[PDB]
Write a protein that binds this ligand. Structure first.
Ligand SMILES: *[C@@H]1O[C@H](CO)[C@@H](O)[C@H](O)[C@H]1NC(C)=O
Ligand SMILES: *[C@@H]1O[C@H](CO)[C@@H](O)[C@H](O)[C@H]1NC(C)=O
Ligand SMILES: *[C@@H]1O[C@H](CO)[C@@H](O)[C@H](O)[C@H]1NC(C)=O
Lengths: 441, 103, 441
């Protein structure tokens, strides 16, 4: 039997319903999401990391001159400094006083840390949505499996076939461009490859951490060696990756709305409480028992013994009943006024049973279904004492949930009196208008 | 069989089983003479722009008819106003210039 | 010196321009696209191929019975056929006549051909655009490099840095979902994984060609073995992949607009002539010569000796000139009326030179920019004789390209005549109003 319904996109809050198959006793169904994962499709654009400046041994030409040539090296620099007279540990290196040249060379490489300490720039496109669903029904214990939240792919969970509809909201916390560094994700419109500026995030760009074509854009400039010293001095703009790591700011992990939890393997946003999720579950035909084979419950009377509209199961109610064929009978409240903690109760030939519920209404009025029967529960609920709690609300608050009977009474008096004032004035006008007509005629 | 395909200035690609695709484009070699008489001019543009020529000629005829009808009405109305002051005066002089321009 | 312009998105048609640097003689620039490739981002959804029905040996229980069990095999079938009395080469296999039992098992697995002969279902998202550009400027020979059409990433082509703007149109021939089979690509809206139907494209679905979790949806029904025969007969819906091969229809390779060519490694659409492409190229400073160092041309007289508005360079023109220093001189036509074949000419002290051009106009009129100078060329072009040609038009047709002098004459007469006739009516109406006024006064 296929049961179709819509459940909210909430994690840790179970969805409860009664599967009512004509001719069979209701089968209690409970569907709880363990996690919801939005897994977008990503394409690695390039990898950024701290650069290393490689400086080969300078060519010191004594009594002569040399010339620089271009080479296929990132940010390659070459300059010939004439008029040098370097000294070594063994004395003057060159003979001529000024007819000597030192050719300095330098180029940018990926540092050793780039294998581990680097940021991956990704293009993010709409991907897939998956969830872990925990389901129990009738006398079948909790079973779970990974499912695809697409409304098409069915999943077999404990002999039951579950189809989870697509999320009503297509919202995703990732922008078209994200930067992944370590365990953190940043929404960052990184520069296109080959466009990174010196001292900025993209100063060093590589298509992959093992590529042999590196883009480097630093103001690497060779300076003249100090008088008499064989060395290759240079100036360069400090690494824009090191700068970025200082100024990264808040990661997406700390600013994603709806409480999303960001994971990287694969990149995904977990437990985003957005919209609702249509569902369809085909319950096995063996889970249903004929009406005549289940207990008949009658003379139901529901008394609310205690109630507070707290986020926990603050309500307590006692239901008196009369029955036959003592046995288990499911309990459910079809309306959103109250969420019942217990899923089923054991009924004797006569007596009473108690159940707990959570409600946001100051004067809750809800229907309670006891298998083949139902009763209406009414009462008053006190305000909760705790200002802050460490758990989410089980119930749902409606527009009129907070309006007390006293507030309704004042609204009725307001509208009734206000309307009567205008109505009486209009009637008086109509009566005098008729009298004036009869005066003329 | 004989297969005829319409080819425009954009070109047409055709592939014959197991042969490489071939591309062809049509040149503006239509019949007519755009420098000749109206008959030859209209024929050329009709062959080169069938729909545009039909719309163009219909629009021109509409503009001509609307313009000619409006101008004829304006001149007939003007003539009546010019001669009426004298038609109601059997002994009026009826100036010679007015007799030639209005009557 | 940066030169920026917009060139049409056409392959094989070169873009020509004169780079005019203040104080320096113009440098002829020619940019030609060799190919253009739209490379979308693709995610393999699953692999479809023809199924194989694996049938393990049947279990024959003589004088007894057996029970089937559930197994994870795809589309696994198990049925116990009682009352079997099989015979083999050695005679009756069982002693009992009707108390024997044969159990048959069957399941679906990927065929060997699925390693090679299978269809890949892909989800297609906006990716990247790349092109091969052939560039020559001044006296520098043709140079080419592969570039990214991003509008930001620069490319070094023969000491010149080229930046190509994004295509003016985001159009792509690939739909959101495509099926790649062999060398062909189909815009086929394939069913999601787990929802394929028997005898249809998705009857068998596998996430990868090596995946151990195979989805198979065929109406595989075990039949009762024939009387006295040990075999496992079964009925099954013919493979939906083989059925698809017959009905797959025309591939995207044969219906894609704009003449797009489809390639698979990577999946891409090539040479789609859609819109225009912005370009930005920095010509090296060494390429420019001071104006005072180049020839000065004067008394330019352009005569059109023959013209046909054919797709080829059907126009021929002769320009008489006088020039100092008798040097080389770039030739260009900035107006879109005609495209000049020659890039430059060799000038003497005095004489004339000829150039070829292609124009769509019946009465072309264009400015020919002889280096540092200009000459206006006007003429009459005859219609081409060839009805069909195997090469694209080298020129660009305009709205008024076909309007002849006689056509303009008739348009002017019709517009002028009707306008003049209207004015005559309005003037006569106003004049008579004054005549009537003077009658009263
Ligand atoms: C499903 O819920 C039950 C009870 O809440 C729990 O015992 C079980 O571990 C849950 N399943 C998972 C996968 O956490
Ligand atoms: C194609 O055109 C020729 C004449 O040009 C004609 O004889 C033939 O019947 C036509 N065939 C079709 C299919 O139009
Ligand atoms: C560039 O153009 C020249 C001449 O047109 C040609 O020889 C060369 O092969 C072209 N380059 C490419 C990559 O096709």
């Amino acid at each position: 039997y296929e049961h179709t319904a819509v459940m909210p996109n909430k994690v840790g809050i179970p969805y409860k319903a009664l599967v009512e198959r004509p001719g069979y006793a209701p089968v209690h169904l409970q569907i709880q999401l363990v996690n919801t994962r939005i897994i977008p499709s990503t394409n690695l654009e390039y990898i950024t990391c701290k650069y290393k400046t490689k400086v080969p041994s300078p060519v010191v030409k004594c009594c002569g001159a040399t010339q620089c040539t271009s080479k296929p090296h990132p940010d390659y620099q070459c300059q010939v400094f004439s008029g040098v007279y370097p000294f070594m540990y063994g004395g003057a290196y060159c003979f001529c006083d000024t007819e000597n040249t030192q050719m300095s060379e330098a180029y940018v490489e990926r540092s050793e840390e780039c294998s581990i300490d680097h940021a991956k720039a990704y293009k993010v496109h709409t991907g897939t949505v998956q969830a872990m669903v925990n389901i129990t029904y009738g006398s079948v214990s909790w079973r779970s499996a990974d499912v695809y939240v697409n409304g098409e792919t069915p999943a077999k969970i404990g002999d039951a076939k579950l189809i989870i509809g697509p999320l009503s909201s297509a919202w995703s916390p990732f922008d078209n461009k994200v930067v992944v560094y370590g365990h953190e994700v940043y929404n960052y419109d990184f520069p296109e490859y080959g466009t990174g500026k010196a001292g900025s995030f993209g100063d060093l760009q590589s298509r992959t951490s093992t590529s042999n074509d590196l883009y480097a854009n630093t103001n690497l400039k060779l300076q003249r060696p100090q008088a008499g010293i064989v060395h290759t001095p240079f100036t360069q703009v400090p690494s824009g990756f090191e700068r970025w790591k200082k100024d990264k700011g808040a990661p997406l992990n700390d600013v994603a709305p709806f409480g999303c939890s960001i994971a990287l393997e694969p990149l995904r946003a977990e437990n985003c409480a957005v919209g609702s999720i249509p569902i369809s579950i085909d319950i096995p035909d063996a889970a249903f028992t004929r009406i005549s084979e289940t207990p008949t419950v009658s003379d139901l009377e529901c008394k609310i013994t205690e109630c507070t509209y707290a986020f926990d199961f603050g309500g307590i109610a006692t239901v008196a009943y009369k029955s036959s064929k003592a046995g288990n009978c499911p309990i459910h409240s079809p309306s959103g006024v109250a969420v019942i903690k217990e899923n089923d109760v054991t009924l004797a030939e006569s007596g009473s049973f108690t159940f707990h519920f959570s409600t946001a209404n100051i004067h809750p009025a809800f229907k309670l279904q006891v298998c083949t029967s139902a009763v209406t529960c009414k009462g008053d609920c006190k305000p909760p004492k705790d200002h802050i709690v460490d758990y989410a609300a089980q119930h749902t608050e409606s527009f009129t949930s907070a309006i007390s009977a006293t507030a309704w009474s004042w609204i009725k008096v307001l509208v009734g009196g206000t309307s009567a004032f205008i109505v009486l004035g209009l009637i008086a006008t109509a009566v005098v208008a008729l009298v004036l007509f009869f005066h003329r005629h | 069989t004989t297969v005829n395909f319409t080819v425009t200035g954009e070109g047409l690609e055709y592939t014959w089983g197991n042969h490489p695709p071939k591309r062809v484009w049509a040149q503006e070699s239509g019949e007519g003479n755009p420098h000749g008489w109206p008959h030859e001019v209209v024929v050329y543009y009709y062959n080169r722009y069938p729909l545009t020529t039909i719309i163009g000629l219909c629009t021109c005829v509409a503009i001509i008819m609307v313009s000619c009808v409006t101008s004829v009405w304006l001149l007939c109305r003007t003539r009546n106003l010019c001669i009426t002051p004298y038609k109601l005066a059997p002994n009026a002089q009826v100036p010679i210039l007015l007799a030639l321009l209005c009557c």
